[PDB]
């Protein structure tokens, strides 16, 4: 029994890592959104930057 | 002839004498048995918990 309670500690410890890991990856996701609207932003500026009548 | 009945009457004594002795040799037996089996029947009981735990594994 105790080596079960331990079997079940170790279910509870794949399911704590498992959410452990979903956790990180949605974050990395949210990073990557971030990274697009400043990539998107550069774009803009070069944009901007085309224009003589603004960028001088 | 009360010598004779006397004498039988010894004989029968002794013969129950031997017949409880012998009892106390099987009492002595039977719980060594007893602790045999017991032993037999915990190996026993280890292997069905041991089954279940594989099951719920």
Same mark, same amino acid.
């Given at each position: =029994?105790?080596? /079960?309670?331990?079997? =079940? ?13 979903? *956790? ?29 009548? %603004?960028?001088? | ?11 029968? /004594?002794?013969?129950?004498? /031997? ?6 040799? %099987? ?18 009981? *280890?292997?069905? *918990?041991?089954? =279940? ?5």
């Amino acid at each position: =029994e105790k080596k /079960e309670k331990q079997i =079940e500690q170790q279910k509870k410890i794949q399911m704590s890592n498992l959410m452990n890991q979903a *956790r990180l990856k949605v974050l990395r996701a949210r990073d990557d959104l971030i990274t697009d609207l400043l990539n998107e932003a550069k774009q803009r500026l070069s944009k901007v930057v085309k224009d003589t009548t %603004r960028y001088q | 002839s009360q010598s004779q009945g006397i004498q039988q009457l010894l004989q029968a /004594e002794k013969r129950a004498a /031997e017949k409880v002795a012998d009892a106390r040799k %099987r009492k002595a037996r039977r719980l060594k048995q007893a602790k045999e089996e017991a032993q037999m029947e915990v190996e026993q009981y *280890r292997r069905e *918990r041991e089954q =279940e735990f594989q099951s719920k594994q």
